[PDB]
Design a protein around this ligand. Structure first.
Ligand SMILES: C[C@@H](O)CCn1cccn1
Lengths: 412, 412
């Protein structure tokens, strides 16, 4: 019968910090992690900035020998996973290793490594492709490498659902625990899409902000002057654990995961429907799964991408789901500060939602100077808002019309 | 408690055929789908052959214009998915569309597209990258395009667990139905990694057979002269359906999906442990999940990739799990004929497992001329074996030590 699931550990690399506390300090201070990209020459590109992880030292985690074989998205996902496992205090033993699994996902995976090997193939020949090309690039190898390093023998998989990946990863990992397939899961996502193919491919779709001359103001969810998403890198990981398992070992519990929703839009390969119908279906599924009155929702960490169509679809979905209560809850987009971590967005934002519960504060939507037509909810413009938060919801929406919603609540 | 899950539709593209019945006729005849790869200069490569899909006409499924947007692996997954839904006879309606979802995955995804867009980026710069590069390449677009085309609003996601993808996709879709999150799921996987990067990437790891002189004899699982796997393309899709839902509409039921196992080896990035400990745990988990004794198993569709370490690990796992029943079951590798479809392997092999139950016949392991040391099980060498089959397993073992097992049972 369905077990309860709590959060006992969290880990992060983001454009605001090399761990959770440093990132959250930046979130609550309204700080932007966005800057001109330094790691490559983008003069031929329409977008030349994004949210880089600054000063990442892989030798805090892995030998230089192993790090050299692994795409940055794997290095970032292992960094966040190791932080989360250490934060949990959990000791892996022969008695429990078969009951601990991992579900760390990515939207795009090891595009930097694939591009660099493609360069070798075309400039030199196939004999110069790395022997580590496949295991160092493919998306399931955060789960694989974490399992090898920590001895995790539970369910071992990876989701790839574009910008919904981190939220789906955490929800499905929670279902694994709820249904008794595991007692502990490390779940979340990682992304490092800031290579020519990533910036070029999103640039070709004209999906990205082109505010090159003022990168910290580019990400402006629900602002009338928004012009697309800001591409960002990093990772979030959470240790999910069955409630009685956590209680038995005296774990510190940050919050309980009470609800998860999925829905498909079935509308368009890339565009969200203007009325947010799929997002509304998804939230309603999540609230019913959590056994809640929608009026219990205090805080929503929106997807809030800073796209014209995305941001207004989310307002429409929240109004449809919450009715008059839409005007009482607080909703913010932390992408205003972090940018869009794609398959890691739902993972870092789940962590921000749990910290909103721990600290009783709604993170701001920075850059919300002139709310657009109909964007008239409490969007926590400019500055963090201390408030009562018993229930927090984190939404994600992606290409393919794929939607996820997580519902967290205070645990006493 | 849990609902029962049955298979009511199947669809496939393989090196043997452009549908299930053509592919299956090849399987029972012991035919190879392996040949030198055409319309591609592989002079500089150590492997020049594989399993291609021959004569695929995407305009049976999509307009030319929609097809131009999508990588071949997405085209192949949509072909299998549309076939499976047609084969099921299911009528999607406003009354059931929120109860029908999709989980079609891929191991490596859009390599061909990445390679072609790399060419443009390196030669001409980012302004020649296609606008559809991202949504036409990412792994969740089979699920996305299928949901949009058929109006499916249920759970919409995509797994990527390397060579385990198709098995995990089917198993987790079965969990969705069993636990009441959906009544119908389209599940499986697709792959087209025959590009410079795929042949070059596996080649650099010296993982591929290099038997260029006799491609049809390259894939020789458990044979003492095997020298690595054969890379193959295609797709498999199954319609999974809650039993009472199938019975109410008069569905044709092929078989019941009674068990699903997952485990992680936690051993090595690409190699299984010599004793197949992880594969043994995974099969034991799948049998416990089905409430079956190892002695009830009649037929195993092996992962059976034709790698030195993989093939011998599976023999050890089967001996461990099955004890004095290990010789009574029949175990065959259909990869002897199809080669290794990577993330689609588990999907086409679940279909072959279901058809082994329908037709009471174990498919052959072709090329098994000289069984290796300790390879003394009933490996169905050379020729199909009519036999009693009530319970059939299908195993997948992938990079990162990720394991999956499905258990199918005759339905009457
Ligand atoms: C001082 C910190 O960077 C330690 C990171 N860490 C290594 C394993 C788990 N957390």
């Amino acid at each position: 019968s369905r077990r309860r699931v709590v959060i006992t550990g969290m880990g992060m690399l983001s454009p605001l910090g090399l761990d959770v506390p440093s990132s959250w300090e930046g979130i609550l201070a309204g700080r932007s992690g966005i800057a001109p990209i330094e790691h490559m020459d983008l003069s031929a590109y329409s977008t030349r900035f994004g949210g880089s992880v600054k000063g990442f030292n892989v030798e805090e985690y892995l030998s230089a020998k192993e790090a050299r074989k692994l795409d940055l998205f794997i290095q970032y996902g292992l960094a966040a996973s190791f932080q989360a496992v250490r934060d949990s205090g959990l000791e892996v033993t022969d008695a429990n290793r078969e009951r601990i699994g991992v579900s760390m996902g990515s939207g795009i995976g090891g595009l930097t490594n694939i591009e660099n090997n493609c360069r070798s193939l075309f400039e030199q020949g196939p004999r110069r492709i790395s022997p580590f090309f496949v295991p160092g690039s493919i998306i399931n190898m955060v789960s694989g490498f974490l399992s090898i390093h920590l001895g995790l023998q539970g369910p071992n998989y990876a989701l790839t659902t574009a910008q919904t990946t981190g939220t789906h990863s955490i929800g499905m990992a929670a279902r694994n625990i709820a249904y008794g397939e595991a007692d502990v899961m490390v779940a979340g996502g990682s992304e490092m899409a800031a290579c020519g193919l990533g910036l070029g491919g999103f640039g070709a779709a004209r999906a990205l902000s082109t505010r090159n001359d003022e990168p910290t103001r580019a990400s402006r969810p629900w602002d009338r002057d928004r012009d697309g998403f800001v591409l960002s890198d990093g990772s979030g990981a959470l240790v999910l654990e069955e409630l009685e398992h956590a209680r038995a070992r005296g774990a510190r519990i940050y919050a309980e995961l009470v609800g998860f929703g999925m829905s498909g839009d079935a509308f368009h390969m890339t565009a969200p429907p203007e009325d947010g119908a799929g997002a509304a279906r998804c939230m309603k599924n999540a609230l019913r799964d959590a056994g809640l009155d929608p009026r219990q929702v205090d805080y929503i960490n929106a997807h809030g991408t800073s796209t014209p169509a995305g941001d207004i679809a989310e307002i429409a979905a929240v109004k449809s789901v919450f009715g008059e209560h839409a005007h009482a809850l607080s909703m913010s987009s932390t992408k205003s500060m972090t940018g869009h971590l794609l398959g890691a967005a739902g993972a870092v934002e789940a962590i921000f939602s749990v910290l909103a519960l721990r600290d009783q504060v709604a993170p701001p939507t920075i850059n919300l100077d002139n709310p657009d037509e109909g964007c008239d909810l409490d969007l926590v413009a400019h500055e963090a808002k201390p408030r009562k938060i018993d229930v927090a919801l984190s939404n994600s929406f992606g290409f393919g019309g794929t939607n996820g919603t997580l519902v967290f609540r205070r645990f006493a």
